[PDB]
Amino acid sequence: MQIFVKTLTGKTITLEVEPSDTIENVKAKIQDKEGIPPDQQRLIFAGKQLEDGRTLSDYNIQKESTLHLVLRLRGG
């Protein structure tokens, strides 16, 4: 399958992934594209902050989905 990741400005890009790719895997693929390291990357999907250990399977991020990218965060 393939997913979309909307990056900082809005220039949308696509990633080649499959259901058991971890969010850690996806955050090295966005380092290939946008030149941002996986440690200052946070991925949002449906309002939920996607965790680094868990898979694309764990949030049902199927074919044609659009993840969003923000530059590191900490609430509180």
**What does the alpha-carbon distance between residue 63 and residue 38 come to, in Å, rounded to a whole number?**
22
Minimum CB separation from another protein for residue 46, in Å? 5
- Sites of contact with another protein (CB under 8 A): 8-11, 13-14, 16, 18, 32-37, 40, 42, 44, 46-49, 66, 68, 70-76
Q: Considering beta carbons, is residue 40 or 62 the nearer one to another protein?
A: 40
Minimum CB separation from another protein for residue 74, in Å? 4
Of the candidates 44, 73, 72, 74, the residue with the CA atom closest to the CA atom of residue 59: 44
> What one-character-per-residue DSSP string does 33-64 give?
HH---GGG-EEEETTEE--SSSBSGGGT--TT
Minimum CB separation from another protein for residue 37, in Å? 7
